[PDB]
Design a protein around this ligand. Structure first.
Ligand SMILES: OC[C@H]1O[C@@H](O)[C@H](O)[C@@H](O)[C@@H]1O
Ligand SMILES: [Zn+2]
Ligand SMILES: [Zn+2]
Ligand SMILES: [Zn+2]
Length: 522
């Protein structure tokens, strides 16, 4: 009975045509089983601890996430974490992405691959937290006064390595797997969120890196890896979010300790914003040596309004319906401390085109929260539509939703909606909806099929929504197939719906993701 205002959506198979790269469907920390079942072709190995991974010991340091403990993997075979990750990805037809540390300071181990700790309680004294279950001497590096322990010796739990040390890892990967061109590892990620090393890796990097240090690191590590494999693709810098797009880690830190009135690094570099200057330095280097070191320009982005978590109150559901505007919308002011028009994807494409053309664009971490709730799933389906429409070259969600959740099934609406790996189309085309906070829509034409696939997301918290879809420039059969996800948490194959001219009409349940598969003539 309950009913929302009617909506009309116009899909025109001739407007705004461009490929959708299947790499937008990427994921982090999935399994061979879920990579195959979600039909996902990109698998990222990345995140905080990967900055500290010692490929020669097969070990890493957890940083601030786990008491700055250096911890060995079970195996002591050089590089096994990476090899295992690659085998498991390729077992499912997915391309792996491996993070190579750039930070220099990576884990070492004590006698018998025993754990080490950067903030030993016996060495630096009483602190306010410690690993009391598994390693009691490992402090959190904060004194009981709440003031950080400072002056710790970086060798307590780590060893300082350089680009020749990580080049050795690239040589190993190439020997096991072949080059990228020959079916080997295609993507090298350079580190992870380097601007905030001063916080995630305070033990070993207490001062935020300048934009110089980070440029030098991409130049250095990038050259080494490309010597070993000129066919592989380098991805970076993996910056953490809004402030990391315009301010180096040195300036972020400086600002947190001294207020925002004077940014020393920014000032030393004529008022440039960080990532645009980084892109521009890489351009100048590429123009001068003739060699491309960075191929994919990558950032992380998480909404700032409290949506990353499990708050599923009404007000938070409505905010998730709106806040994905930050990924595309030039007029949307973000409703948070950011308080500015982020329009991330156009921004990424604009920066690349202004400062380093021909570089691809990636969001290699995002998450909009509420994974186990229909609102998380409408939101995820909303995000995947936006990636394709807006022309992002790659993406990796952080991380992979549990197979029981409706969010898992949202990804599967795009990639394996019938259990036979049929997927949304791969040439984006215009679909226009009047208000995407209430209902958003995305279309594409499928190359294998000529089918027009149209995804409609009803974001409204209650009531059915009558919906009419108008096709231009597409000659369609009599009937369109219907597949649907609601809070019932199952992909349903509903009844075919009859086309009325080049229109079709239907009733959309509240908080639902609906897929129309509309085959071409004849
Ligand atoms: O917010 C979740 C994640 O984002 C980033 O800060 C890091 O890459 C991850 O290791 C972290 O846990
Ligand atoms: Zn450094
Ligand atoms: Zn400089
Ligand atoms: Zn100071």
């Amino acid at each position: 009975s309950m009913q929302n205002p009617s909506v009309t959506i116009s899909v025109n198979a001739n407007a705004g045509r461009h490929p959708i790269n299947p790499a937008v469907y990427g994921l982090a920390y999935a399994t061979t089983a879920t990579l195959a079942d979600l039909n996902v072709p990109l698998h990222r190995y990345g995140g905080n601890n990967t900055s500290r991974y010692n490929w020669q010991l097969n070990a890493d340091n957890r940083g601030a996430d786990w008491y700055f403990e250096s911890i060995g993997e079970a195996s002591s075979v050089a590089g096994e974490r990476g090899d295992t990750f690659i085998a498991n990805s390729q077992a499912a037809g997915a391309q792996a992405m491996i993070t190579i540390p750039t930070i220099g300071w990576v884990a070492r181990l004590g006698a018998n691959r025993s754990k080490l700790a950067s903030f030993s309680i016996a060495k630096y004294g009483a602190q306010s937290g410690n690993d009391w279950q598994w390693f009691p001497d490992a402090g959190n590096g904060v004194l009981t006064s709440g003031q950080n322990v400072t002056g710790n010796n970086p060798n307590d739990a780590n060893t300082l390595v350089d680009s020749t040390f990580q080049q050795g890892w690239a040589q190993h990967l190439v020997s096991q797997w072949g080059t990228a061109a020959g079916g080997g590892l295609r993507y090298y990620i350079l580190d992870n969120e380097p601007s905030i090393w001063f916080s995630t890796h305070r033990d070993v990097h207490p001062v935020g890196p300048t934009m110089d240090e980070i440029r030098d690191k991409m130049l250095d590590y990038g050259a080494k890896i490309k010597t070993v494999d000129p066919s592989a693709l380098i991805v970076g810098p993996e910056e953490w979010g809004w402030s990391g797009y315009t301010l180096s880690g040195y300036d972020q830190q400086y600002g947190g300790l001294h207020g925002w009135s004077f940014m020393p690094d920014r000032n030393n570099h004529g008022g440039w914003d960080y990532l645009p200057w980084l892109l521009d330095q890489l351009r100048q280097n590429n123009l001068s040596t003739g060699r491309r070191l960075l191929d994919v320009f990558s950032v992380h982005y998480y909404p700032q309004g409290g949506e990353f978590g499990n708050d599923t109150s009404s007000a938070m559901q409505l905010r998730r319906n709106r806040s994905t505007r930050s990924l595309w919308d030039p007029n949307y002011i973000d409703e948070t401390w950011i308080n500015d028009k982020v329009q991330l994807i156009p921004r990424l494409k604009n920066w690349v085109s202004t400062y380093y053309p021909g570089t691809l664009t990636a969001i290699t971490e995002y998450n909009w929260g509420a994974e186990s709730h229909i609102n998380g799933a409408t939101t995820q389906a909303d995000i995947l539509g936006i990636f394709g429409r807006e022309g992002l070259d790659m993406a990796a969600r952080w991380t992979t939703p549990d197979t029981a959740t409706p969010t898992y099934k949202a990804i599967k609406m795009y990639r394996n909606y019938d259990g036979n790996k049929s997927a949304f189309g791969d040439t984006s085309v215009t679909a226009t909806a009047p208000n995407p906070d209430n209902v958003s829509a995305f279309a594409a034409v499928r190359s294998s099929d000529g089918a027009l696939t149209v995804m409609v997301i009803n974001k409204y918290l209650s009531g059915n929504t009558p919906a009419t879809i108008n096709l231009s420039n597409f000659t369609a059969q009599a009937q369109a197939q219907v597949w649907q996800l609601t809070a019932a948490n199952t992909i349903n194959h509903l009844s075919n719906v009859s086309l009325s001219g080049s229109s079709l009409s239907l009733t959309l349940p509240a908080q639902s993701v609906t897929l129309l598969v509309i085959p071409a003539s004849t």
